[PDB]
Amino acid sequence: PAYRILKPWWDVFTDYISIVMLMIAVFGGTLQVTQDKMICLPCKWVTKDSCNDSTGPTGIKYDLDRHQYNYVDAVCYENRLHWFAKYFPYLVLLHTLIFLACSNFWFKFPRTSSKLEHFVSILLKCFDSPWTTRALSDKKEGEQAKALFEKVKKFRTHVEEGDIVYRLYMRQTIIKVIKFALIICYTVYYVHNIKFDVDCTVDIESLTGYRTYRCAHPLATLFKILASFYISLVIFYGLICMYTLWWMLRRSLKKYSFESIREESSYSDIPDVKNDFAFMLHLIDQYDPLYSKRFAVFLSEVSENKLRQLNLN
Amino acid sequence: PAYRILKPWWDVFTDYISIVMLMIAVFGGTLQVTQDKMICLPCKWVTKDSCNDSTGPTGIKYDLDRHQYNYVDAVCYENRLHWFAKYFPYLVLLHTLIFLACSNFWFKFPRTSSKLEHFVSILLKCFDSPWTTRALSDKKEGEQAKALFEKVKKFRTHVEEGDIVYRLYMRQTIIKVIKFALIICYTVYYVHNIKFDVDCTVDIESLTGYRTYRCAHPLATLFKILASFYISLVIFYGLICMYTLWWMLRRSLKKYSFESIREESSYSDIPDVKNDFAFMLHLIDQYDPLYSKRFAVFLSEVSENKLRQLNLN
Amino acid sequence: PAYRILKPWWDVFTDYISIVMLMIAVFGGTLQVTQDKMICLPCKWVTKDSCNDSTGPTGIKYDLDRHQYNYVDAVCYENRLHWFAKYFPYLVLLHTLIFLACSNFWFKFPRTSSKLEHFVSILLKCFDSPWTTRALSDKKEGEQAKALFEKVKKFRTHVEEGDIVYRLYMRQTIIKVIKFALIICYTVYYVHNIKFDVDCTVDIESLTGYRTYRCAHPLATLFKILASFYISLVIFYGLICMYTLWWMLRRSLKKYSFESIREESSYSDIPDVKNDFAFMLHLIDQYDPLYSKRFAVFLSEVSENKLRQLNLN
Amino acid sequence: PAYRILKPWWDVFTDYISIVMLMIAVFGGTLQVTQDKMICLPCKWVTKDSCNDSTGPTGIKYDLDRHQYNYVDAVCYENRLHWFAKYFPYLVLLHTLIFLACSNFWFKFPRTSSKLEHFVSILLKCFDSPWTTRALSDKKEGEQAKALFEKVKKFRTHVEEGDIVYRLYMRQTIIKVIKFALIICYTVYYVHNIKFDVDCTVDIESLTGYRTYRCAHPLATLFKILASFYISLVIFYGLICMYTLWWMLRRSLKKYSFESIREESSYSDIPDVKNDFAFMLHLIDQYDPLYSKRFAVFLSEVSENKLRQLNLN
Amino acid sequence: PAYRILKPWWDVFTDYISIVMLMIAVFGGTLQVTQDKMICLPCKWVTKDSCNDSTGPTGIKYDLDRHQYNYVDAVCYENRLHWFAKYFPYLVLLHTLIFLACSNFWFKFPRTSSKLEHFVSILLKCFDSPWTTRALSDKKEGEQAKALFEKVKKFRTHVEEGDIVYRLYMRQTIIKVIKFALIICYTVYYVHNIKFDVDCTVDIESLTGYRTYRCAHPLATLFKILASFYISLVIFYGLICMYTLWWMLRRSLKKYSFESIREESSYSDIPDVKNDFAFMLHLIDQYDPLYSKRFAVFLSEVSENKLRQLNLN
Amino acid sequence: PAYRILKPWWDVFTDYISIVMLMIAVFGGTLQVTQDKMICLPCKWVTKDSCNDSTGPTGIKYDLDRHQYNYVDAVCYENRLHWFAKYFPYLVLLHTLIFLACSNFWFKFPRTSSKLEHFVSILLKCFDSPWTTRALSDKKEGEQAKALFEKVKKFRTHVEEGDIVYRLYMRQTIIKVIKFALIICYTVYYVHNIKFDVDCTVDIESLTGYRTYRCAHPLATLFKILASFYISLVIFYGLICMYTLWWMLRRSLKKYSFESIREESSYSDIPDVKNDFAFMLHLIDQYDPLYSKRFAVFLSEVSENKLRQLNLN
Ligand SMILES: CCCC[C@@]1(C2CCCC2)Cc2cc(OCCCC(=O)O)c(Cl)c(Cl)c2C1=O
């Protein structure tokens, strides 16, 4: 619908950071399932379960076929390779899906979807009411206008009693910021774990004839870039959601301060909201202060009284 | 159409869990048909039809080509590998298609599609009727309004006699919950069956020269993750549909209790529904209690009588 | 357009069974063209043109390269493999395309497309006529209403003379049911023909040096599942179209029985249809009995006469 | 736009036959570029530049590597394989594109696109004119109606002078039928040319050491099916366009016979068309005879005169 | 938008020739990046840096592995293969993108996009004005009509002063025709350069042991077809744009000749255009002469005067 | 929305150059991940850690298998190949995403998205106001017109106080031009770094037996083309954004010069804008000077006064 109004900048940036994060997850994964192989060779001279590194030169002959080179490639890939190298692209796609859910859960949950759609529906009618132009400074619009005064007066009490919307948005960002804290905790802790050269000692002499091998994961660099890119993409994500958390904890959005628009418009009799109609009003003010300024007229009694006198006369 | 109104939260969560379940089925399957191979080697020293595991080291020579390594890879894949490892991604896609059908069967079946579309069609007109604003607290809308009083009075009897809708939704969830009970029964029972190292004794010495071989299914881990993920995705699915089953068995949705909206609105003469018009009314109340509160006016006689006096005068 | 009205449940189920049938045909085929290979080995000791099956063990050496292993793989695949294993996915896609054509041929053929679009066009206007509400129990709608009385009176004779629509729907299902009878005849007859282990005796000793070989079709199981799934998907298809055939042969849909709606509505002067306007009326009654009940008013003479008196007065 | 009206059944069937023809061309081609390889082996004993076909058995050793097996595979594929086996899928896609162009050229050419769009535009207004209902058996529609009488009288002369439309449709089908005659001429003539077993004598002993080889094209069967399917798909195509050619040569569509609709409607003063407005009128009659019957009223003078008297009085 | 009006036939054919040209570029390229390999063998006996071509036969043994067959395949592919064989599909895609840009640059450039959208906007209103029907042979349309007389009188001077549109279309085709002249110059000159059999003398004896090799580019034929098809597709393109160049150089489109429509309509006082409003008027006349004939009325003074007298009286 | 109005030609060209730049990045990358391999051979005679290059000829035998040819291919690819050859396609996709963000950031940021949507919304109403036709040379449009005079008078002060829009467009191009300066700095500096023949000395004698190898990157040419194409594509990009930077620094767009439209229209009392409403007005003038000329009437006082007298009388 027209839900762009309810997405501040801190949820517009985040909506795109949660796409590029998806692009590397689906790119790293399709690359992984595509090849993600290991090239493993034996080491004739072994010491400490490691390669000892002990006319014209000739090649070395291990006497192995292509099929018992591939066996050891799999064994040394399943056992002696770290889980974070193999399953990383599938892991950051998971976390991406959480971030996409934790921002659209607000809209899809029906107890809050109705209230939001109720709020945007009256605002566009309030925004598109011709009569508000006369008051911010005929008869058909006046009856259309009083029709909107009443439902707004019912909307003023229908939604104001419930406080679910401010809590979801409060319990959506606060877990997103807890989520970003855990990603950076382990991801940086295991990013060093992946590397190109890996040794494996898998204990198969009955099949091949060698105990230790030396492997070479070629995608170790290309993943190390994406993880270093992913962490840097998430830190910018985390600071965004850390700011909106602070904003929701300092400004005290439960109660709205409507004394400024009444200061200059000479409408002393305008009520101040208590809870959960202030917030969504505090939110759309982030978009612009115009949609609330056009709304201050439908919520005053003398403005209704002036319409009533014009409607009486 | 506008059928979002008829989907509670327990069918909104489930609509997305039935997509991620599809994503792993189509991902596990395209991965399966892609490679899903086995690397099988012989064992020179055999005991109990198993590998006995009995200067510088050299490779072992079995004297086999690439084509009779691939033959044994297929035989040991078709016979001595469990059916649940090969056909798992095709199996959870089947179950997914059932869950998608068992929730849209409600909408597509014509005996119930008409009634539902009949219910949403009058509600939006009831919701968008300007006259309801006057009554919840001119002449053209009154005739438009009485036009809606009559069809609602016919709708009150056209649908109320049949009880098919409440039974489909009752026979859709109750088999879905029976379905979730069987998935968890066998899936956990065979998830241990898949594993990386598998031995095979296939009885082909005329072709290769060896009796027993040792194989290595490399995707055994990656599938074990998805199955452990699938089971955990289904248990959250099952508890959802277990709750809506309880809800439909405790609240007694055949009869609706409309005595609350009349308590405060001063409309004593409002009838109570008997069957199959209560339910769909009990359902949209889950979305919000506003669409039914705006509907209580079109179903009362004095509200029609007050319109009639305004229409007479 | 709005042709959902003209599709009963027995053509809604069938519309989806004809998609999953397509999914396995396109899945079996892309899988077939992808690999569909055979791994064929010789047999040194042959008896009856079959494999005779006659310190540490060593591999057997046939002295063949990769290119004369692939030659015999093709020869034993083209000749000594059954045609039903290779061309099955391309065969059930054909049959699927017939089933999709034999149900949309009704709509695309212009001699019948016009009549159907003529029928749905007046019904929605009959359904959306405000005047029908007064009669089922002002002046502008009355002229709009009489405008519809006349074209319906011309539609009553324009279409009633032709009988093409009832014959197409009669000649569409009756060949579909003849089609399902032939599919089950041969498909079950050749489903046993496909199997994993197949022997081939292709008579090429000048090239390889061996007369007989033993092959291994690995997809033999995976196709045997789809065919067993396809047959089970078609039997449910066939019973659907066997029921609608019986329905069209027992109820005698050429003549409609309109004596019920007139029994309670007190409209004795309502005509009974003869052919090809009864059927499409008998069909939409399957959707709901409401679209015909709202239609009984535009087809009566006294209802026109009562409008005429209201139009005269 | 609404150009379904101008497509008879013989151009509705053909519109779908020209899609399945495309499906095999794009399927045969993607299959061709995918593999389309040849497996070629030498023949030690040669006679007439052909394979002479002259304890336990052992494999034959030619002493060749994988890279000089692939060279001969290409040489024997480029030279000693017929051009119709390699380039068939690219050839029937060409012919398909012609058939799609030779039926939409009618619509895209601007000298004829305007006339057709002019014809469908007045017909829907003639079809949707409320006044035609009164005449086939008020004041605003009468002026709307006379507004349409005049442009139709100008349309009667604007298009009738030119004859380009009847010639394009005459020069579109007559070359399509000439095209179908050539396809069947050569396609059947070379369909036998493709086959599985092909010999090649390419004269390269300096590189490999053998003069003659025996090859095996594995796709020879699968293409032989598609060509036998393509020819059978085109013969049904050709008979369609052979019928519409006969129809356009027997009925004499230059002049329309409008004496039937005037016979029963009692409108003696109705003119008969001469050229290129008869045809498009003769065409839409194929769809239904109703759009022309509703059109006979706007083209008569007394019908205009009766409107004029109702407009005068 | 509705810019089909501004595309004559010589830009409708060209719009489709510039798609099939794209289809072979994207087909030749995806085929190229897919395989585009070379099979290269040595020649033991060399003369003039070329292959000298000097009981049962046996294969020749060069003693090379698969990895130093692939090295020479790349060296003889990068150096001793012509640049036109490798980069041809990427080259004709470039030229295609120019042709698509050189025909939509007219529409996207804002100095000319506005004028064109201004011209089509008034024409449809002129075409859809009911009053033009009376004049080509009431009060609300007259004021709507005079509203259009004035903006057309301002449009007559707003656009007529600038001449950018006629120069872009003049400088778009004249470079397209210069472009077609260069394509045919070099493409035919290098099409012979590609061929199947290519020799290479790359000077690597330290690695392989041979000086000269003989290679086999297998796609040389399939590209030779596309280039011969591309050249034949461009010559038909070039003659199209050579004709529209001549048309724009013979007819003198700067000044329009409006004396024909006034000859028969009896409107002597109609002005003749000078520049850049004649052209776009000369262009839409190519579509049909009807849109200009309906336009001659809004541009005459007595037609405005007759409206003025009807507006005065 | 209708944001084509706010994109001059220097942001229309750039919108397409930023697509072809994307096409080579996604083409170079999918090509890279596809193969991007190296063919590496040893050198028996080494000097200076480089290949010394020291009857019938025979092949050279290094005694290496396929698996220790692939190991060295990876080691010599990860270490002794330049980072700019491997990661180039992923690098120019990054820079492309910046250029796409740095031009749509203007539109997506809500503090500026509202102002722009506010500006285009009144302009189309100003453009589509019928009354402007009378003034540039009835009663309902006059009230519709005065309704627009007031909001424009509020829009004249609502947006004029803020200066964010002119700074974003100033801080978007000035960093884009700083970005183009850095691309050309390093890209040309490392484009020579990629090449076909590369030597590697990786210090693995324990595994293979050779110290130095000679490799062959086959894609070195095809990337050198794209980079030379990318640099040439960016230089045309950079000059575009260098011109719009100069334009924004010479014309002094903070203040608009509205004295020309008033010179000829005889409206002396028209105000001159100060900041941030001049710019967006200076911008749409680039599209055409007509949208501002039609706007000069809604911003004058006597034009409102003349409407007021027509509204008073
Ligand atoms: C003559 C020495 C025997 C060893 C092998 C054996 C002899 C026959 C094969 C094994 C190893 C190998 C590996 C090869 O590459 C596999 C690419 C498969 C694909 O295309 O995916 C090729 Cl070509 C060759 Cl000749 C060879 C050999 O010389």
Interface probe for D, chosen from C36, C75, C156, C206 (most Cβ of D below 10 Å), is C206
Point out the residue among F8, F41, F52 whose CB comes nearest to the CB of E110.
Answer: F8
- Separation between Cα atoms, residue D51 and residue D213, nearest integer Å: 8
F197 Cα: distance to centroid of ligand 1 (angstroms): 26
- Separation between Cα atoms, residue A259 and residue A255, nearest integer Å: 12
Single-letter amino acid code for the residue at E38: M
Beta-ladder partners of D197 = D216
- Separation between Cα atoms, residue C300 and residue F176, nearest integer Å: 76
Look at strands F39-42 and D39-42 and give their pairing: unpaired
C66 Cα: distance to centroid of ligand 1 (angstroms): 8
Method: cryo-EM
Rg (CA), chain D: 32
By the CB < 8 Å criterion, does C218 face chain B?
Answer: yes
Determine whether the interchain pair F71/A216 forms a contact, defined as Cβ–Cβ distance below 8 Å: yes
Q: Is residue B199 classed as helix, strand or coil in its secondary structure?
A: strand
| E strand or H helix at C50 | strand C50-51
Q: How many CB atoms lie within 10 A of CB B113?
A: 19
Its sign, for the CA torsion B169, B172, B176, B177, is: positive
Query: Cβ neighbours of residue A301 under 8 Å, at least 6 residues apart?
Result: A269
- Separation between Cα atoms, residue D287 and residue D6, nearest integer Å: 8
CA distance F48 to chain E (A): 16
Q: Are F221 and E78 in contact (CB under 8 A)?
A: yes
Residue ranges lining ligand 1, Cβ < 6 Å: A 66; B 66; C 66; D 65-66; E 66; F 66
D34 Cα: distance to centroid of ligand 1 (angstroms): 22
Q: After which residues is chain F broken (C to N over 2.5 A)?
A: 54, 137
- Separation between Cα atoms, residue D190 and residue D179, nearest integer Å: 17
Residue reference for tokens 């890939």: A77
Query: CA-nearest residue of chain B to C135?
Result: B150
Query: Cβ neighbours of residue D76 under 8 Å, at least 6 residues apart?
Result: D38, D40, D198, D200, D202, D213, D215
By the CB < 8 Å criterion, does E77 face chain F?
Answer: yes
Single-letter amino acid code for the residue at C139: K
Q: Could you please report the per-residue DSSP string of E40-60?
A: EEE-SSEETTEE---------
**CATH 1.20.1440.80, applies to F3-54+61-312:** yes
Let me know if chains E and D touch, i.e. at least 3 Cβ pairs under 8 angstroms: yes
CA distance B263 to chain C (A): 32
Determine whether the interchain pair B137/A150 forms a contact, defined as Cβ–Cβ distance below 8 Å: yes
Single-letter amino acid code for the residue at C104: N
Single-letter amino acid code for the residue at B3: Y
Q: How many CB atoms lie within 10 A of CB D309?
A: 10
Q: Is residue E254 classed as helix, strand or coil in its secondary structure?
A: coil
DSSP state of D192: G
- Separation between Cα atoms, residue D115 and residue D123, nearest integer Å: 12
Q: Could you please report the per-residue DSSP string of C235-253?
A: HHHHHHHHHHHHHHHHS-T
- Separation between Cα atoms, residue A89 and residue A26, nearest integer Å: 7
Residue reference for tokens 């699915």: B237
Determine whether the interchain pair D110/E288 forms a contact, defined as Cβ–Cβ distance below 8 Å: yes
By the CB < 8 Å criterion, does E139 face chain F?
Answer: no
Cα angle, residue F40 at apex, residues F37 and F42 outer, rounded to 5°:
170
By the CB < 8 Å criterion, does B104 face chain C?
Answer: no
| E strand or H helix at D110 | helix D110-127
Beta-ladder partners of F188 = none
Tokens standing for E233?
Answer: 């597709």
- Separation between Cα atoms, residue C138 and residue F85, nearest integer Å: 80
Cα angle, residue F194 at apex, residues F192 and F200 outer, rounded to 5°:
125
- Separation between Cα atoms, residue B95 and residue B175, nearest integer Å: 12
CA distance F117 to chain E (A): 20
CA distances from F124 to E116, E298, F3, F148 (A): 18, 25, 12, 11
Which fold does the domain D3-312 belong to in CATH? Answer: de novo design (two linked rop proteins) (1.20.1440)
Q: Could you please report the per-residue DSSP string of E169-220?
A: HHHHHHHHHHHHHHHHHHHHHHGGG--SEEEEE---TTTTS-SEEEEE-TTH
For residue D71, which residues of chain E lie inside 8 Å, CB to CB? 39, 41, 216
By the CB < 8 Å criterion, does D130 face chain C?
Answer: yes
Which fold does the domain B3-49+60-312 belong to in CATH? Answer: de novo design (two linked rop proteins) (1.20.1440)
| E strand or H helix at D46 | strand D46-47
Q: Are C165 and C276 in contact (CB under 8 A)?
A: yes
Q: Which of B59, B56, B20, B23 is nearest to B41 (CA)?
A: B59
By the CB < 8 Å criterion, does D71 face chain E?
Answer: yes
Q: How many CB atoms lie within 10 A of CB F205?
A: 12
Its sign, for the CA torsion F96, F97, F101, F102, is: negative
What is the arrangement of strands in the sheet containing E39-42, beginning at the earlier edge strand? E39-42, E212-216, E197-201
B30 Cα: distance to centroid of ligand 1 (angstroms): 28
- Tell me the H-state helices in chain E: 13-34, 67-78, 83-86, 88-108, 110-127, 131-136, 139-158, 164-190, 220-250, 259-265, 278-287, 290-293, 301-312
CA distances from F113 to A9, F1, F119, F158 (A): 11, 12, 10, 14
Determine whether the interchain pair A44/B57 forms a contact, defined as Cβ–Cβ distance below 8 Å: yes
Q: Are C283 and C173 in contact (CB under 8 A)?
A: no
Point out the residue among E64, E137, E287 whose CB comes nearest to the CB of D114.
Answer: E287
Look at strands F46-47 and F50-51 and give their pairing: antiparallel
Q: Is residue B191 classed as helix, strand or coil in its secondary structure?
A: helix
CA distance B169 to chain A (A): 20
- Separation between Cα atoms, residue D68 and residue D64, nearest integer Å: 6
Residue reference for tokens 């461009």: E234
DSSP state of E276: S
By the CB < 8 Å criterion, does E35 face chain F?
Answer: no
Q: Are D56 and C44 in contact (CB under 8 A)?
A: yes
CA distance E117 to chain D (A): 20
Q: Which of B132, F264, C192 is nearest to E154 (CA)?
A: F264
Single-letter amino acid code for the residue at B36: D
Residue whose CB lies within 8 A of the most ligand 1 atoms, among A66, A67, A68, for a mutation test: A66
By the CB < 8 Å criterion, does C16 face chain D?
Answer: no
By the CB < 8 Å criterion, does F289 face chain A?
Answer: no
DSSP state of A303: H
CA A66 to ligand 1: nearest atom: 11
Query: Cβ neighbours of residue F138 under 8 Å, at least 6 residues apart?
Result: none
- Alpha carbons within 13 angstroms on the beta-carbon side of residue A89 total 23
A65 Cα: distance to centroid of ligand 1 (angstroms): 9
Its sign, for the CA torsion E104, E106, E112, E118, is: negative
For residue E108, which phi and psi values (nearest 5 degrees)?
A: -90, -30
Beta-ladder partners of D252 = none
First to last CA, chain B: 40
Point out the residue among C44, C64, C109 whose CB comes nearest to the CB of D56.
Answer: C44
Q: Are C16 and C100 in contact (CB under 8 A)?
A: no
CA distances from C242 to C130, C246, C278 (A): 41, 6, 22
SS3 string, chain F, reads CCHHHHCCHHHCHHHHHHHHHHHHHHHHHHHHHHCCCCEEEECCCEECCEECCCCCCCCCCCCCCCHHHHHHHHHHHHCCCCHHHHCHHHHHHHHHHHHHHHHHHHHHCHHHHHHHHHHHHHHHHHHCCCHHHHHHCCHHHHHHHHHHHHHHHHHHHHCCCCCHHHHHHHHHHHHHHHHHHHHHHHHHHHHHHCCCEEEEECCCCCCCCCCEEEEECCCHHHHHHHHHHHHHHHHHHHHHHHHHHHHHHHCCCCCCCCHHHHHHHCCCCCCCCCCCCHHHHHHHHHHCCHHHHCCCCCCCHHHHHHHHHHHHC
- Separation between Cα atoms, residue E149 and residue E155, nearest integer Å: 10
Q: What percent helix, strand, coil does chain D show, rounded to 5?
A: 65, 5, 30
Beta-ladder partners of C233 = none
Determine whether the interchain pair E207/F60 forms a contact, defined as Cβ–Cβ distance below 8 Å: yes
Beta-ladder partners of A215 = A40, A198
Residue whose CB lies within 8 A of the most ligand 1 atoms, among F61, F66, F70, F73, for a mutation test: F66
Q: Which of B184, B188, B283, B194 is nearest to B234 (CA)?
A: B184
E145 Cα: distance to centroid of ligand 1 (angstroms): 85
F35 Cα: distance to centroid of ligand 1 (angstroms): 20
- Alpha carbons within 13 angstroms on the beta-carbon side of residue E198 total 28
Question: Which residue is closest in CA terms to ligand 1's atom 20?
Answer: D66
State the architecture of E3-53+62-312 in CATH terms. Up-down Bundle (1.20)
Single-letter amino acid code for the residue at E56: G
CA distances from C137 to C131, C232, C303 (A): 11, 50, 12
Look at strands A46-47 and A50-51 and give their pairing: antiparallel
- D35-38 contacts, C-beta under 8 A, 24 or more apart: D35/D219, D36/D86, D36/D219, D37/D73, D37/D77, D37/D218, D38/D73, D38/D76, D38/D77, D38/D81, D38/D198, D38/D215, D38/D216, D38/D217
- Separation between Cα atoms, residue D121 and residue D291, nearest integer Å: 12
Q: Is B310 exposed, middle or buried (0-12, 13-18, 19+ CB in 10 A)?
A: middle
Point out the residue among F64, F70, F114 whose CB comes nearest to the CB of A59.
Answer: F64
Chains near D, with 3+ CB pairs < 8 A?
Answer: C, E
Determine whether the interchain pair D207/E12 forms a contact, defined as Cβ–Cβ distance below 8 Å: no
Tokens standing for D224?
Answer: 């032989």
Q: Are C136 and C265 in contact (CB under 8 A)?
A: yes
For residue E23, which phi and psi values (nearest 5 degrees)?
A: -70, -35
Provide the CA C163 distance to its chain's centre, in angstroms.
Answer: 23
For residue E32, which residues of chain D lie inside 8 Å, CB to CB? none
- Separation between Cα atoms, residue B52 and residue A206, nearest integer Å: 9
- Separation between Cα atoms, residue D125 and residue D127, nearest integer Å: 5
- Separation between Cα atoms, residue D160 and residue B64, nearest integer Å: 84
Q: Are B107 and B3 in contact (CB under 8 A)?
A: yes
Q: Which of E262, E251, E259 is nearest to E286 (CA)?
A: E251
State the architecture of A3-52+61-312 in CATH terms. Up-down Bundle (1.20)
Q: What is the dihedral of CA E192, E197, E201, E202, to 10 degrees?
A: 90
Question: Which residue is closest in CA terms to ligand 1's atom 3?
Answer: A65
Q: Are E102 and E172 in contact (CB under 8 A)?
A: yes
Tokens standing for E292?
Answer: 């200009």
Provide the CA E117 distance to its chain's centre, in angstroms.
Answer: 22
Look at strands D39-42 and D46-47 and give their pairing: unpaired
Q: Is residue E108 classed as helix, strand or coil in its secondary structure?
A: helix
> Domain-by-domain residue ranges, chain E?
3-53+62-312
Q: Are D126 and D295 in contact (CB under 8 A)?
A: yes
Helices D110-127, D88-108: inter-axial angle, 10-degree rounding: 60
Q: Are C116 and C3 in contact (CB under 8 A)?
A: yes
DSSP state of D160: T
CA C65 to ligand 1: nearest atom: 8
Let me know if chains D and A touch, i.e. at least 3 Cβ pairs under 8 angstroms: no
Q: Which of C219, C212, C213 is nearest to C195 (CA)?
A: C219
- Separation between Cα atoms, residue D141 and residue D126, nearest integer Å: 12
Tokens standing for E69?
Answer: 């067959």
- Separation between Cα atoms, residue C279 and residue C283, nearest integer Å: 6
Q: Which of F196, F197, F223 is nearest to F91 (CA)?
A: F223
